[PDB]
Ligand binder design. Structure first.
Ligand SMILES: Nc1ncnc2c1ncn2[C@@H]1O[C@H](COP(=O)(O)OP(=O)(O)O)[C@@H](O)[C@H]1O
Ligand SMILES: Nc1ncnc2c1ncn2[C@@H]1O[C@H](COP(=O)(O)OP(=O)(O)O)[C@@H](O)[C@H]1O
Ligand SMILES: Nc1ncnc2c1ncn2[C@@H]1O[C@H](COP(=O)(O)OP(=O)(O)O)[C@@H](O)[C@H]1O
Ligand SMILES: Nc1ncnc2c1ncn2[C@@H]1O[C@H](COP(=O)(O)OP(=O)(O)O)[C@@H](O)[C@H]1O
Ligand SMILES: Nc1ncnc2c1ncn2[C@@H]1O[C@H](COP(=O)(O)OP(=O)(O)O)[C@@H](O)[C@H]1O
Ligand SMILES: [Mg+2]
Ligand SMILES: [Mg+2]
Ligand SMILES: [Mg+2]
Ligand SMILES: [Mg+2]
Ligand SMILES: [Mg+2]
Lengths: 7, 371, 371, 371, 371, 371, 7, 7, 7, 7
C-alpha cells in the first residue's frame, strides 16, 4: 500500500 | 448555586456550567488501554487513558468507545469518563450541585436506569435530569416550533415539535451516523490505495473527513467532474509526514447520508426520513414545520449540507412551500448550548429529580418525573 | 346605557352592542384541548383554547363544539366560551348591563333553565332575555309577516309569523343542518380520493364547502353535465400546499338539503318542510306567507339556493301565487342584526327579566315572562 | 362451472374455488426485490418474488405491500401478485371462469375502476363482482342481521346490517389496523431493548405478535401485575437462535385498539366506534344489533378480545341489553368463507358483471350494477 | 476453444485449462537474482530465475515475491512470472484464448488497472476477467450460500454470500496470513535455538511449518502438556543433514491465527472476524450462514483447524445453531477448481471483457463490466 | 547495600557498582591458553589467562572468545571470566549482593537458563536480573521514547520503545557487528599487502581499526578521492616497530555496515534495518521515533557515523521529519551506565529474582519474572 | 390516499 | 442492543 | 337529547 | 547457534 502496511 | 451541563453522547463529551455560553471541557469519549508489554520500570504509566490522553498516545493504546449508537455498553469505562470529566476536566465536585444529562430518543430503558443510579450512587449527585437532545437544540435556536435534526456520531434523529407539544409518534431514529461514515470512508480509501485498520488509524481517518469532505449538490455530475479533473483532488499530510491525495472520495463519503444503501443500510435517506416525519404530522402544522427545519450536531458541518437538504426537501415537498434550512454557525454545540439555557431557566427548577424522590420511588422514577 | 347582543348558537358566536349595525366579535364556538405531551418547559401554554386560538392551533388541539343541534351539552365549555366572548373579545364587563341571548325553537326546557341561571350566577347579568332566532330575522328584514327559514350549523327551523302572532303549531324543526352537510361532504370526498378524519381536517372541509359549493337548479342534468365536463371541476389549495380538485361533489353536497335521504334522514326536504308549515296555516293567510319567504343563516349563502327554493315551492304551490324568496345580502347575520334592532327598541325594555324577578320566582320564570 | 373467490385485501391473500370450505392459497401480499449485487453467475434468480418466496428470502429482499390501508397503490406489483395467485398457487386459468373480489367500504373510486379494468384486460375474466367484506362475513355466519366488525391488516370497519338493508350512513372506517399495531410494537420493543428496523425484521415482529400477544380485561391492573411479576413474561426464539423475553408489551400492544391515542390516532377506540355506529341506527333496530355483534378478521384472534369488547360495550350500552359478541373459531377466514357461500348461491348469478356489459358501459358500471 | 485459469495470488501460482480438474502448473511466485560474482565463464546462467528454478538454486539467489499481501508491487517481476507461466509451464500461447485472473477483495484500484492493461498489451489476451477468489471457492463447493474463508499466503478474507447476492458491506479483509505465520515462526525458532535469516532459510522454515505444525483445541493445556512431555517434540532434517527438534513451537505458530496480538496485530482473531461478518448480516440469513462455513486456501490445511474453528464459533454463536465447518480434501486448490468450473460454464461467456471493449472504454472498464 | 552491574556481552567486560558513574573493570572477554611447550622450570605460569593477561602475552597464547554473536558457547571459559571479574578485578565477593546481567534480545533460551543457574550455583548470588541492553541505553540517555541502536562486537540490534512499552514485534537483530568488521578488514589488508592471521594479529588489527577508521558521507567520491591522493593515507606503527600505511581501507571497512553485502551478508544495511523497525510501528508514533534515534555501543564511535546515519535515514524517511541522531560522548559505555542507574533505582528493587524464588520455580522463572 | 394518510 | 445492531 | 339524536 | 551461524 501507501499508507499503513509497506505494500 | 449552579448546575453541570453536559453532552454525554457518542463521539465527544461536552461539559460546562449552566449560564456558560460555551462548554469548556471538550474531548473524545474514548478509553484507552495499552496492548504492549511495558518495559521501562519507572515509566509512571497507567492502565487506562481518557480523551486527550488517549489521542496523544493512540499508537500504543487500544481505543474504545463505551457508547455505541447512543447506547452505553461498557459501564465501567463510562464511569471512568465521567470521573475524568468531573475532576480532571471541570475541576469540580459534582456532589455539590445538579447535573443535566442528555440522550437520543428511543433508547433501551435500562440505559436510563443505570445512568440514573450511577449519578446517585457513584457521584451522589444532588439532582438530575435527562433530556432529549433534539429538544435542547430548539432552546438553543430560541424557537418553540420546528423539526430538529440531530445528527451526531452514533445516532441521527428527528423530533418534530410544535410550540412544545412534541409529537412522539413522529420521532425518527436512524443508526446511520458519523461513526459509520468514518468506517465507510476507510473502505473507500482502500480503493484509492491507502490502508487504515488500527483503531488509531480510524481516528486519523476521522480527522481527514472533518477537514476535506464536502457535500455535492449534484452527486452524479460531481462524479462526472471528478473523473476528469484534478481540481477536486486535494492533498493531506499524515502524522508521519506522508502525503496522501484524496480524489472523488472527498464527496462520496458524505453522499451516504442521502443514500444509506451504500453501506447496506436498507433505511431511507436522511431527507426522506425528515420528510416522512413531517408526513406523520397533521396537515395543519406541516406548513410551519417546513418553515423551521433545524440542523444540529457535528455531521451538519459538511459544507453544502444545508443546501443539499434544501434541494432534496424542495423536491419532495409541495410547491410554493417555504423550505428553510436553519443552520447557524456553532450548530455543532447546539445541544450543549440549549442545555445551558434550560438549566439557567428558573422555571425549569421544578423538573429536577431529587435524591429524596429517588430513594422513595426507585430508579423507575426516571420514566415518570422525567420526560 | 346599552345591552349586549349575541348569537350564541351553533357554529359561530356573534356579538356586539345594541345599536351596532354589525357584530364585532365573530368567531367559532370551539373549545380546544391539547392531545400531545407538552415538552418545552417555558412554552407558556394553556389547557384550553377558544375560537381563533383553536383554529390557529387546530393541528394540536382536539376541538369540540359545546353546542350540538342547538343544544348546549358541555356546560363547562359553554361557560368558557362566554367568558372569552365577554372579556377577550368584547372587552366588557357584562355585569354592567343586560344581555340578549337567542335560541332555536323547541329545545329541551333545561337548556333554558341553565342558561338563565348561569347568566345570573356566573356573570351576574343585570337583565336578560331569550329570543327565538327566527323572530329576530324578521326584525332584521323590517317585516311583520313572513316565514322565516333559519338554517344554521346545528339546526334548521321554520317559523311562520303573521303580523306578529307567531303560529306555534306550525313551527318546524329540522336537524339537518350545515354541520351535517360538512360531515356528509367528508364521506363524499373519500369517494373522490381524499381522506379527512381529524377534527382539524373537518374544519378544513368546512372551509372548502364555504368556498366552492353551489346549488344546482337541475341536479339531474347537473350530474349529466359533470359526468362529461371538467368545466365544473375546480381546484383548491390545502394548508400544506397540496392541491385538490373537486368534481361533482361541488353541488352534490348542497343537494342534501333537498334530499335528506342522502344521509339517512327520513325527514322531508327543506322545501317540503317549508311548504308543510304553510299548509298548517289557515287559508286566509297562506297567500301572504307565500309572498314573504325569508332566508336567514349561513346555509342560505350557497349560490343559487334562493332560486332553487323558488323553483321547488313554485312546483308545490298553486299556480299564480307570488312566490318570493327574500334573500338579501348579509342574511348570514340576520339574527344578530335583528337582535340589535330589538334591543335598541325602547318599547322592548319591559320584556327584560330582572334579577329581582329571578330571585323571587326562580329560573322557571323564563317560561312565563319570556317567550 | 365454478368461480374464483379471493380475499385480495391487505396482509394475506386468500383464494380458492366457490363451494370450497377453505381457501387453499394462503400467502402474504408481498413483493420482494433484491437490494444487493448478485454475484454468482448461474444463480438462476429473479428480480421479483412473491408471498412465500418473499418470506423465504426476506433477508435479501426489500419487501413491499402493494396494498396500504385497503388501497392499491402499486398496481404493477398488484398485478404480479394476482398473476402468481392464479397460476402458481391456484394452478388455474382465470380466463375460464368468474371471479369474486372484495374490498373495504369507502375506498377511492379509482381503486375499483382499475381493479375492474385489469380483470378485463390483463386477465380477461368472464365475469366479476366486487363485494364488501363485511357483508360477506354475515354470509359466513349465516345471519341477516348484525354488525360486522372486520378488522384486518390495513383497515378496520363497521357495517350494520338489518335483514340485509345495510345502513350506509352508519358505516365506519378506521385506519388503525393490524399493520399499525405491528409498527407500534416495534417501537415498544425498542424500550424493552430490542431493535427491529429492516422490513424483514418487521415481519419477524409480526410473527411475535401473532403468538404472544393477548388482550387484558383490565389494562390498568394488568400493568400493575406485570410491574411485579415474571409470570407475565414470556420467552421467544428469534430466527438466528437468539432468545428474547417479552414483558408487559405482550398486552400493551393489543390495548392500542381500545386506546388509539397511543399512536397519535385521534379517533375513538374500536368499541366506541362500534357503539357509535349503533347510535346512528334507529332505536327500533338497535336492540337486535346489540344481540348480534360479529367479529371478523385476523385481529379478532387475540385471546380475550371478545371479552374485552363485551365489557366495553356493556359499559357504554343501556342496562339489561343482550350484548353478545359472536366470535367463532375460524373467524380469521370469515370473509373468504362467505365469498364461497355467496358464489355458490345460484340466485347470486344475476349479479355478475359481464364483459359484454363492460364493453358497452365502460368501467363506470362498477358503480351501478355492482354495489 | 478453451480458456486459461490461474491463481495468480501470493505464495504459489496455479494454472491449467478450463475443464481440467486440477492445475498442472503449480509453482512458487518467486523471482530470483544472484548476489554473488559469477566466475566460471561458460556457466550458461541467467540474471533471473522463476519458481522451481528459484527454489533449486535458492542458496545463491536473492528471492523476492512480486506480490505482497495480495498486491502486486514489482510489476516487472510480475510480468516475468506470467511469462514463465504461459510459455515454460503451460506451454501455450495465451494470445490464442481468454484468461481468468483472480484477486482478493478490497485491493487498491490500480492493481486491477495494470493487470488488465498488461494482459492486453504484453500478452494481447483475447479476453479476460477478474474474479474474487472467495466466490470461486463456492463454485468449487457447488453451493450458492455460505461464508467463504480464503486464507492464503499474503491475505485472508471473508465473503458472505447468500444465493449469490454477495454482501459487500460484510466483507472482511485480514492481513494476517501464512507469510506472516512463517515470519513469526522464524522468531520463535530463535528462542528454541535455531537461526534462520536468509531468504533461502525463510523458505526452509516454510517447509517445516507445512509438515509439522498443527492446531490445538486447547492451547492453554496444550502448552501445559508440552512443558512436561517429549511426546509433542518432533525431529526434522534440514537440507545439509542437520537434525533439529521442534518443541511447543509446533502448535504455537498456528495459534497466532486465533490470537493475532502475538505479532502486534491489533485485529481480532480469525474466528472473531468470521463471526463479525455474520453479525453484519440480517438476522434472516444468519442461520444459513452458520450452516455453511467454507474453508479455503493453504492455511486451512493445518490438522485440526476445522475443529478449532468449530469450537470457537460455537462459543460465540447462540446455542442450538448448526455450526458446520465445511473443509473438504483438496480445499487447498478450491479457488483454482472453482475457476475451472466457472470458465467451463457456458452462461459465463457473456462476462468476458473483450479487447474491443477495452479499446473503446479504456482500462476503467474493469470497474464496470467486471465485478 | 549495593549491587554489581556488568556488561557481560561480547568484546569487553564492563563492571562496577550501582551508583558508580563509570565501570572500573574494563577488560577483554578473552581466555588464553599456551600453545607451546613450557620449558623453564620455575617460570610460575598458568594454563589460563584472562583479559589483560591475555593481551599482554598474546604472542604465546591462543585466544578465544567464550561469547560469539552474543551467545555464550564456552561455558567453562565463561565461568572463568566471571571468576576473574569478581575477584581479581572488582575485588569483591559477589555472594554478598545482587547482580545485574545483560543481553541482546532474541537469544536462544538456554543461554539465559545457564546464566541464571551459574549465578545461583557457582557464585551463589543473592539476587539477579537479566536486562535487555537496548533498554538500558535509554536509561542512560534519560529518555522514555526512542530507538536504540546497540551495536557491539558480536551483535547489533534495534529496539523501538515508546514511553516504555517496548514493541517486541519490531525488534531487529543483526549479526553484522564489530568482530565481523575486524575480520573483513584483515582480508582487505591482504590486498594492501599485509598479512595478519594469528589470533594475536587479529587483535592488532582491531587496534588499528579503532584508531584509524572513519565513516565517509559519500563512499563513492571518497574512493574517487583516495584513488588520487595520499592525504587519505595514514601511517601506523606495529608492535615490532614496523610501520604500515593504510590507504582507502581506512573508510572501506566502516562502509560494510551500510553495505553488508561486502561480506556476503544478504541482510539489509544498518540504516535500512533501523528504518524498517520504524516501519513496523504504528504511524502515530513513528514521528517521535524519528526524533529520538539513539546510538549506543563501540561501533558508534567511528567519526562521522552519526552523520552518515542521519543522511541515510533522511533519504529513506518522508520529508520535513526531524531526523535526529542522538550520539553523546561516552555512548560506548551507555549500557553499563544505564545499568548503574536502573540498579540504583529503588522502585526497581521489586524486579529482583531471589534464590528463594529460583528454588521453588526453577530456572524457568527467568522467562516469567524477568523480562 | 392523496390527502390525509400517505396512501 | 440485543437484537438487530450489535449494541 | 336523551332519546333520538345523541344530543 | 545450531543452525544458520556457527554459534
Ligand atoms: N468539523 C466537522 N466536520 C464534519 N464532521 C464533523 C466535524 N466535527 C465533528 N464531526 C463529526 O461529527 C461527530 C461528532 O459530532 P458531535 O455532534 O459532537 O457528535 P455527538 O453529538 O454525538 O457528540 C463525529 O462523527 C465527527 O467526526
Ligand atoms: N359563506 C358561506 N357559504 C356557505 N355556507 C356557509 C358560509 N358561511 C357559513 N356557512 C355555514 O353555515 C354555518 C354557520 O352559519 P351560521 O348561520 O352563523 O350558523 P349559526 O347561525 O348556527 O351560527 C356553518 O355550517 C357554515 O359552514
Ligand atoms: N393468529 C393471529 N393472531 C393475531 N393477529 C393475527 C393472527 N393472524 C393474523 N393476525 C394479524 O391480522 C392481520 C392479517 O389478518 P387478515 O384478516 O387476513 O388481514 P386481511 O383480512 O386484511 O387479510 C395481520 O396484521 C396479522 O398479523
Ligand atoms: N500443506 C500445507 N500445510 C499448511 N500450510 C500450508 C500448506 N501448503 C501451503 N501452506 C501455506 O499456505 C500458503 C500457500 O497456500 P495458497 O492458498 O496456495 O496460498 P495462495 O492461495 O495465496 O496461493 C503458504 O503460506 C503456505 O506455506
Ligand atoms: N574507539 C573505538 N572506535 C571504534 N570501534 C571501537 C572502539 N572501541 C571499540 N570498538 C569496537 O566496538 C566493539 C567493542 O565495543 P563494545 O560496545 O564494548 O562491545 P560490547 O558492547 O559488545 O562490549 C569492538 O568490536 C571494538 O573494536
Ligand atoms: Mg449529539
Ligand atoms: Mg343561527
Ligand atoms: Mg380482511
Ligand atoms: Mg489464495
Ligand atoms: Mg554491548
Amino acid at each position: 500500500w501507501x499508507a499503513x502496511c509497506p505494500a | 448555586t449552579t448546575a453541570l451541563v453536559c453532552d454525554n453522547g457518542s463521539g465527544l463529551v461536552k461539559a460546562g456550567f449552566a449560564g456558560d455560553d460555551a462548554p469548556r471541557a471538550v474531548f473524545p469519549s474514548i478509553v484507552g488501554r495499552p496492548r504492549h508489554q511495558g518495559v521501562m520500570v519507572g515509566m509512571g504509566q497507567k492502565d487506562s487513558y481518557v480523551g486527550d490522553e488517549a489521542q496523544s498516545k493512540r499508537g500504543i493504546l487500544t481505543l474504545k468507545y463505551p457508547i455505541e449508537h447512543g447506547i452505553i455498553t461498557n459501564w465501567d469505562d463510562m464511569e471512568k469518563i465521567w470521573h475524568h470529566t468531573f475532576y480532571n476536566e471541570l475541576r469540580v465536585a459534582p456532589e455539590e450541585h445538579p447535573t443535566l444529562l442528555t440522550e437520543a430518543p428511543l433508547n433501551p430503558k435500562a440505559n436510563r436506569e443505570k445512568m440514573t443510579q450511577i449519578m446517585f450512587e457513584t457521584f451522589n449527585v444532588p439532582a438530575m435530569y435527562v433530556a432529549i437532545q433534539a429538544v435542547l437544540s430548539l432552546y438553543a435556536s430560541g424557537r418553540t416550533t420546528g423539526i430538529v435534526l440531530d445528527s451526531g456520531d452514533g445516532v441521527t434523529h428527528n423530533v418534530p415539535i410544535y410550540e412544545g407539544y412534541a409529537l412522539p409518534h413522529a420521532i425518527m431514529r436512524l443508526d446511520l451516523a458519523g461513526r459509520d461514515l468514518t468506517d465507510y470512508l476507510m473502505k473507500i480509501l482502500t480503493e484509492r490505495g491507502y490502508s487504515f485498520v488500527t483503531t488509531a488509524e480510524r481516528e486519523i481517518v476521522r480527522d481527514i473527513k472533518e477537514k476535506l469532505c464536502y457535500v455535492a449538490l449534484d452527486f452524479e455530475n460531481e462524479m462526472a467532474t471528478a473523473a476528469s479533473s484534478s481540481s477536486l483532488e486535494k492533498s493531506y499530510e499524515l502524522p508521519d509526514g506522508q502525503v496522501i491525495t484524496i480524489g472523488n472520495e472527498r464527496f462520496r463519503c458524505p453522499e451516504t447520508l442521502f443514500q444509506p444503501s451504500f453501506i447496506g443500510m436498507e433505511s431511507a435517506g436522511i431527507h426522506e426520513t425528515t420528510y416522512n416525519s413531517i408526513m406523520k404530522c397533521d396537515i395543519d402544522i406541516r406548513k410551519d414545520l417546513y418553515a423551521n427545519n433545524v440542523m444540529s450536531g457535528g455531521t451538519t458541518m459538511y459544507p453544502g449540507i444545508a443546501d443539499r437538504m434544501q434541494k432534496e426537501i424542495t423536491a419532495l415537498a409541495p410547491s410554493t412551500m417555504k423550505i428553510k434550512i436553519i443552520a447557524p454557525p456553532e450548530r455543532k454545540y447546539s445541544v450543549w448550548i440549549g442545555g445551558s439555557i434550560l438549566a439557567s431557566l428558573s422555571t425549569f427548577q421544578q423538573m429536577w429529580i431529587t435524591k429524596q424522590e429517588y430513594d422513595e420511588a426507585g430508579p423507575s422514577i426516571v420514566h415518570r418525573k422525567c420526560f
